[PDB]
Design a protein around this ligand. Structure first.
Ligand SMILES: Nc1nc2c(ncn2[C@H]2C[C@H](O)[C@@H](COP(=O)(O)OP(=O)(O)OP(=O)(O)O)O2)c(=O)[nH]1
Ligand SMILES: [Ca+2]
Length: 621
DNA sequence: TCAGTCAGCTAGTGCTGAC
DNA sequence: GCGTCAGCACTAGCTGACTGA
């Protein structure tokens, strides 16, 4: 059929006879001298539909003038699949205001003159890029030898302006329906992208989704201004890239130690399960069942010193019912089983072939409070213990520099509440976490070890964020045999909140007024459906900690290009960088300066510090 | 063949890991 | 009522298919 073969030469299949094929354009010449396919069926929307196609034999040099002397532009990238490591970019879209969208067919392109102009347009810092869900596209671009410096992703602006009311969607169609008075009609049910040949309607949608971003940017730049939400948007937009680089690299694991520890812990687990079942009075029990094990404990007459019966096996509550043989074995088995199933029996299933490294997937804003989250193998969940963390190593002749913010929260709260005592203490360079570990224990500061500091962390942050005295005493008597009276905990809670008056003022003033709008130091807003004192207290401080970490990522990413270094992980408040063995001192100094000058921006009165340790293995702090 | 007696999904829980 | 999130494993219940009626 000649009808379906209308526009084959441009690598287009005329599936639908709903198209038509050149017009004079008054472009600007390099000396500042003045010098597209369409669909037959029009759309009621005012969004752009026209577009060009740039092919190997369908290139003209003067196309580059369209991007020349520009300010903002839309960009979208459609890919064959979702695995960046084993997928190739299919299409690039560029949408200039009052211009048709421009398409580079990457499969149907073999020369490099076509691409250099787009390269230069991406490079320039002064050109702001509009990309929906920028993380995906930036991942692909950095993988395929592209370098971006500026982004303005409309998902970020939408979610920040949405004030975290509904957690779902925020796709292009939902946002376009919400803010703009347009309906994109995303009826494309993921058509065949692997095939090089593409139908016309699919490309019309591909150009439409890119073109709709420009009006969205125009309107959101006004909407963000009246809300005073520009700072957080800028920080997030500039921090999109370092997440992508960190996820592109990943962290290496030595398979020999992984397999050795797997076999050893498997043998330990089997002997432990044997001992556990033998200690229990029935052999058919499936141990992992919380309800079956609850019934088993009940029929074994396991009881507390008090008149209570086993209602749950939660570790926090389980730690009280000790001094029975079976429960020590139960807890040891639970620990080993968690370590095995969560990590060791699943980590080998995640080590990518031909790379021998793990790769994760960071969630930019899925968290309520703005922290990162990992949906793929969670590198934020790998255990603390050294013997399990050593398996992570740098590449050959490389060494890690591990920097962690020293007491990042309780520095945020100090500014947000502008308390004098906390800020003076942190000028004096004293450790609040160590002091917490010492006051509720022996008074010897030098005797406080890592575990005691770790327990101090939870109690201190909880009492800052609204924990009442009954639950605090439950926690304290659980994790350390204090056996403290209720009056002792009441006195401690009051002493803390009075010796730091600003925090008590903050609690009183946020409780007295049932405000439903809360802001972070980056003006990141939220609206709660119903008041909850704990979340209300939490959100500003944690949001500011997230903002400080994101700005630190931005500054460190900018500064690290000198030494060819690369970032591999960020978890929640620390950064790991792999740098060559010759530039260790430069890497350490750069990392400390970057973290310092990121923290000193939002916090203008407390001097943040960092614990930096040059490590051969990520486990070996 | 309808009516009464049976495997797969499927959201709900409990638990633990990090910060 | 201290917060954010992700992961592993059960097991009621709904819905669906087989043995009489
Ligand atoms: N509400 C609550 N927030 C926590 C808890 N643990 C950590 N956070 C937050 C606050 C921490 O400052 C932040 C970083 O965790 P870290 O383990 O690094 O604590 P920190 O940096 O203060 O100790 P460090 O100086 O690095 O040894 O995560 C917790 O148990 N409860
Ligand atoms: Ca830290």
């Amino acid at each position: 059929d000649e009808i379906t073969k209308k526009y084959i030469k441009d690598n287009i299949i005329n599936v639908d006879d709903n198209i038509i094929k050149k017009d004079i354009f008054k472009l600007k010449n390099e000396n500042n001298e003045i010098t597209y396919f369409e669909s037959k069926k029009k759309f009621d929307d005012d969004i752009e539909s026209r577009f060009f196609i740039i092919n190997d034999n369908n290139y003209n040099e003067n196309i580059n003038l369209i991007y020349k002397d520009i300010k903002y532009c839309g960009l979208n990238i459609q890919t064959t699949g979702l695995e960046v490591f084993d997928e190739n970019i299919r299409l690039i879209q560029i949408a200039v205001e009052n211009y048709p969208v421009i398409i580079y067919d990457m499969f149907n392109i073999n020369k490099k003159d076509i691409l250099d102009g787009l390269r230069k347009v991406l490079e320039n810092k002064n050109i702001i890029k509009i990309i929906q869900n920028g993380k995906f596209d930036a991942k692909f671009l950095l993988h395929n030898n592209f370098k971006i410096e500026n982004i303005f992703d409309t998902y970020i602006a939408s979610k920040l302006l949405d004030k975290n009311k509904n957690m779902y969607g925020f796709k292009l169609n939902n946002i376009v329906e919400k803010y703009l008075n347009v309906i994109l009609d995303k009826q494309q049910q993921n058509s065949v992208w692997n095939n090089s040949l593409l139908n016309n309607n699919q490309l019309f949608y591909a150009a439409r989704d890119s073109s709709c971003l420009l009006k969205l940017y125009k309107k959101l730049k006004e909407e963000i201004k009246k809300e005073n939400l520009h700072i957080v948007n800028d920080i997030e937009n500039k921090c999109i890239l370092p997440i992508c680089d960190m996820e592109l690299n990943g962290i290496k694991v030595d398979l020999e130690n992984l397999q050795k520890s797997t076999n050893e812990i498997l043998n330990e687990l089997n002997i432990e399960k044997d001992n556990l079942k033998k200690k229990l009075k029935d052999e058919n029990i499936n141990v992992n069942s919380q309800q079956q094990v609850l019934k088993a404990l009940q029929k074994n007459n396991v009881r507390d010193i008090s008149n209570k019966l086993i209602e749950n096996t939660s570790d926090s509550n389980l730690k009280n019912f000790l001094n029975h043989e079976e429960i020590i074995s139960l807890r040891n088995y639970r620990r080993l089983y968690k370590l095995y199933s969560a990590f060791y029996l699943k980590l080998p299933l995640h080590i990518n072939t031909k790379t021998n490294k793990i790769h994760t997937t960071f969630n930019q804003l899925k968290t309520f409070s703005g922290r990162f989250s990992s949906e793929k193998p969670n590198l934020q969940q790998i255990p603390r213990q050294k013997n399990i963390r050593e398996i992570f190593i740098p590449n050959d002749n490389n060494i890690f520099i591990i920097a962690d913010f020293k007491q990042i929260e309780l520095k945020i709260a100090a500014e947000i509440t502008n308390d004098e005592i906390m800020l003076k203490a942190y000028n004096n360079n004293i450790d609040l976490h160590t002091l917490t570990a010492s006051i509720i224990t022996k008074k010897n500061i030098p005797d406080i070890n890592k575990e005691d500091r770790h327990i101090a962390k939870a109690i201190n942050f909880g009492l800052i964020y609204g924990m009442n005295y009954v639950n605090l005493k439950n926690y304290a008597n659980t994790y350390y045999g204090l056996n403290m009276s209720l009056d002792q905990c009441l006195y401690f809670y009051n002493s803390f909140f009075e010796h730091y008056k600003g925090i008590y003022k903050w609690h009183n003033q946020v409780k007295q007024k049932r405000a439903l709008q809360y802001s972070t130091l980056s003006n990141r807003k939220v609206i709660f459906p119903y008041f909850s004192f704990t979340k209300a207290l939490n959100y500003p401080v944690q949001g500011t900690c997230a903002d400080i970490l994101k700005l630190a990522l931005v500054d460190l990413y900018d500064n690290l290009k000198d030494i060819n270094g690369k970032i591999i992980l960020c978890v929640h408040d620390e950064i790991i960088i792999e740098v060559n063995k010759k530039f260790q001192e430069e890497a350490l100094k750069i990392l400390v300066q970057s973290m310092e000058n990121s923290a000193s921006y939002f916090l203008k009165k407390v001097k943040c510090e960092v614990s930096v340790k040059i490590a051969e293995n990520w486990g070996s702090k």
